[PDB]
Structures are given as structure tokens and as C-alpha cells.
Amino acid sequence: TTCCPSIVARSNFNVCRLPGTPEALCATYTGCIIIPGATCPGDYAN
């Protein structure tokens, strides 16, 4: 599951993913994170 710290970060994550870039690279690029669960915390609410 991916979780993002802000709106901007999610929007940039979704563009990063368009060419097929791995989630893990898009995470370090944007500040978003990958978690094994399904419930994002309050500081990664977007």
C-alpha cells in the first residue's frame, strides 16, 4: 500500500508511476512510503 505525506507528493507519485517506475523508486523520489498493511498513518494521510 502506498501512503503520501501531502497532496503534491501523491500527484507527483502518480506521474512517476506512469512509465512503470517501481513504487520503491517513486517513494524515495516523492517522500511517499510503501507499507505492508492497508492503513496509512495520520502523517501520511494522502
Side-chain angles (χ1 to χ4, degrees):
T1 300
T2 57
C3 308
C4 292
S6 68
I7 296 292
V8 158
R10 177 67 65 183
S11 297
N12 291 336
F13 187 94
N14 288 334
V15 168
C16 178
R17 289 283 288 159
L18 289 173
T21 313
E23 296 187 330
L25 284 166
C26 295
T28 53
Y29 161 68
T30 62
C32 302
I33 65 172
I34 299 174
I35 61 169
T39 310
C40 294
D43 58 343
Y44 290 84
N46 297 121

